[PDB]
């Protein structure tokens, strides 16, 4: 009869980039989402399939927690049936998405002067990314004829590039953290309630 360790998840001090997006399986809780819902410290709070108030007083069997760092202008891409850099090559929610998405400004925590060279995002690929498809491969794709041999050069450098994240940027050009919820139902009994 313990609560979900949302503190260490949301209030975490270190986040992984989107292509190497992290995952934490969470279950068997008594859940109060209203502490976040009414916190009013979140610049954006949407999700699809169940309303927040109706889900707070409801039991569920399995939930996952994922998180990464994207750009503000591209926040809208975190939605079913969207397109763009991230939707194509870094993260793509399925159309029948039943989780929840939250995002807030983190210019005060993650941005750094001179440009934060930590977080990355995948650029090219031979096809589209499947649902929840992780691709940690930094393999130099070869769209030419001469052999590649690993080295970076005249053909298709790393499918990995880092944001700038200068703090002097506009609104949409500053990192907004994100935590992607996942809500699923199976034959197992509901372990999380309120």
């Amino acid at each position: 009869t313990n609560l979900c360790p949302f503190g260490e998840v949301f209030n975490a001090t270190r986040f992984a980039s989107v292509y190497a997006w992290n995952r934490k399986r969470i279950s068997n809780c008594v859940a109060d989402y209203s502490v976040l819902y009414n916190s009013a410290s979140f610049s954006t709070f949407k999700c699809y399939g169940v309303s927040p108030t109706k889900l707070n007083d409801l039991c569920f069997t399995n939930v996952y927690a994922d998180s990464f760092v994207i750009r503000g202008d591209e926040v809208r891409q975190i939605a079913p049936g969207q397109t763009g850099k991230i939707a194509d090559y870094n993260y793509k929610l399925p159309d029948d998405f039943t989780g929840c998405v939250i995002a807030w400004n983190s210019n005060n925590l993650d941005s750094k002067v001179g440009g934060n060279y930590n977080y990355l995002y995948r650029l090219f690929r031979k096809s589209n990314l499947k649902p929840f498809e992780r691709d940690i491969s930094t393999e130099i794709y070869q769209a030419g004829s001469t052999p590649c041999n690993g080295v970076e050069g005249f053909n298709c450098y790393f499918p990995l590039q880092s944001y700038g994240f200068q703090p002097t940027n506009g609104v949409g050009y500053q990192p907004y953290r994100v935590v992607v919820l996942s809500f699923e139902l199976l034959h197992a009994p509901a372990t999380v309630c309120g």
Partner: antibody, heavy 120, light 108 residues
Framework: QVQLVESGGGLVKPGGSLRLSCAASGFTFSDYYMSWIRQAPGKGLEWVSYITYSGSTIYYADSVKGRFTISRDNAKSSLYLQMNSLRAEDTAVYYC?????????????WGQGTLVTVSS | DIQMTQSPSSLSASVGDRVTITCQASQDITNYLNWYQQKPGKAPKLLIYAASNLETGVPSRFSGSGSGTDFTFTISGLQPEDIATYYCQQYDNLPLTFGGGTKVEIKR
């Protein structure tokens, strides 16, 4: 819409130097190669330079090596170029060309360009 | 370093005529060539890339083909606005190079 505005130019003494820029808009400037092509008045095109995304790898033409340099700036979304030890025959309109964009297609909307002369 | 050869160097025809330009390579390049259009004063513009693909927004009256070493580009019907020099360039090896140049007038 996707454009490519170029910086200034004008007369330059023989052997002098100048800095060229190429502002961008309508595309995440951090996701494309870059290249510079020059065309003398009423002649054929000619490749000069080619820079990758991060300034990691650099290529020049065998006739321009040791005198050209490229750079990038993912923040300002603006490509630069500084040319030194100018020869008289370098007078042309140096364009601003991307390469092998996100989808696959090479040498897309690369734009107007700026005249650069060598005379006094 | 690989030389490219455009042919011919000049061309004239009236409206509705079909013309063909030819490009012959030095060594083997499978399907890596583009076709350009440069109206006087303005900046060039991609017409056909990989020597086989149609650029979006370009009239379907343009088309060419070729593979390996010999490549050709054709125009179905001339138009009073398609008067411009045409250019092709290699697409594989490190030292890129362009064609030689070819003008296309209109005969009246």
């Amino acid at each position: 819409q996707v454009q490519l505005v170029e910086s200034g130019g004008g007369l330059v003494k023989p052997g002098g130097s100048l800095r060229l820029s190429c502002a961008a808009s309508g595309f995440t400037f951090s996701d494309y190669y870059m290249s510079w092509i020059r065309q003398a008045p009423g002649k054929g095109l000619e490749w000069v330079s080619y820079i990758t995304y991060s300034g990691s790898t650099i290529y020049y033409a065998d006739s321009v090596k040791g005198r050209f340099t490229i750079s990038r700036d993912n923040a300002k979304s603006s490509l630069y170029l500084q040319m030194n030890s100018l020869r008289a025959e370098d007078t042309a309109v140096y364009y601003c060309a991307r390469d092998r964009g996100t989808t696959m297609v090479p040498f897309d909307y690369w734009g107007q360009g700026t005249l650069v002369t060598v005379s006094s | 370093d690989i030389q490219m050869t455009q042919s011919p160097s000049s061309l004239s025809a009236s409206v509705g005529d079909r013309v063909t330009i030819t490009c012959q390579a030095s060594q083997d390049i499978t399907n890596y060539l583009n076709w350009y259009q440069q109206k006087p004063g303005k900046a060039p513009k991609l017409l056909i890339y990989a020597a086989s693909n149609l650029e979006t927004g370009v009239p379907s009256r343009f088309s060419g083909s070729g593979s390996g070493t010999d490549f050709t580009f054709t125009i179905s019907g001339l138009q009073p606005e398609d008067i411009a020099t045409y250019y092709c360039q290699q697409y594989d090896n490190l030292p890129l190079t362009f064609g030689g140049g070819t003008k296309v007038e209109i005969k009246r």
